[PDB]
């Protein structure tokens, strides 16, 4: 029903997740109803073979903070059929975050949420700190972006 969901192609596709980021990476599979399911995490510099399927949908996040990451320099990864038995590479990297978002990342990592409002900063930043990264907001944005085109 949702635009962004895995399709039950039942066509096997071998994939290699390669973490070329400095974060611990959480692979997230969008199931057939478009709901996120987590898979075991990947340390920096590590690669791992996965048995996935043509037309399944993946995204990749910081396992601890849920910051969004890039896969093959984009947001969503979709396996195709292997050619020559060669696995398909999903190379995970850091996006160029805005300076604001990167600062929010660092502050969030050092301040408990119940203490955001104890910080002596401009008031509008409180909501900014509290609007944590998360898969559902990104999927909304990507869905509208897929409609547009």
């Amino acid at each position: 029903r949702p635009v962004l969901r895995s399709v039950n192609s039942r066509e096997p596709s071998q994939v290699i997740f390669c973490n070329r980021s400095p974060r611990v990476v959480l692979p997230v599979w969008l199931n057939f109803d478009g709901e996120p399911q987590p898979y075991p995490t990947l340390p920096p510099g590590t690669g791992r073979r996965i048995h996935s399927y043509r037309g399944h949908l993946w995204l990749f996040r910081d396992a601890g903070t849920h910051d969004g990451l890039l896969v093959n320099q984009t947001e969503l990864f979709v396996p195709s059929l292997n050619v020559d038995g060669q696995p398909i590479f999903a190379n995970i990297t850091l996006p160029v975050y805005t300076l604001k978002e990167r600062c929010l990342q660092v502050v969030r990592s050092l301040v408990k949420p119940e203490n955001y409002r104890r910080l002596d900063i401009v008031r509008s930043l409180y909501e900014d700190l509290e609007d944590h990264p998360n898969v559902q907001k990104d999927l909304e944005r990507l869905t509208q972006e897929r409609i547009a085109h």
């Binding site: 039950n8 039942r10 290699i16 390669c18 973490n19 070329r20 599979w29 199931n31 057939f32 399911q37 898979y39 075991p40 990947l42 510099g45 590590t46 690669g47 791992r48 073979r49 996965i50 048995h51 996935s52 399927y53 399944h56």
Partner: peptide, 17 residues
């Protein structure tokens, strides 16, 4: 038909990439 979800092979091991 039955649904088939992604799975990690039992004989897979991690490597440096």
């Amino acid at each position: 038909l039955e649904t088939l979800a992604p799975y990690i092979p039992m004989d897979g091991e991690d490597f440096q990439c």
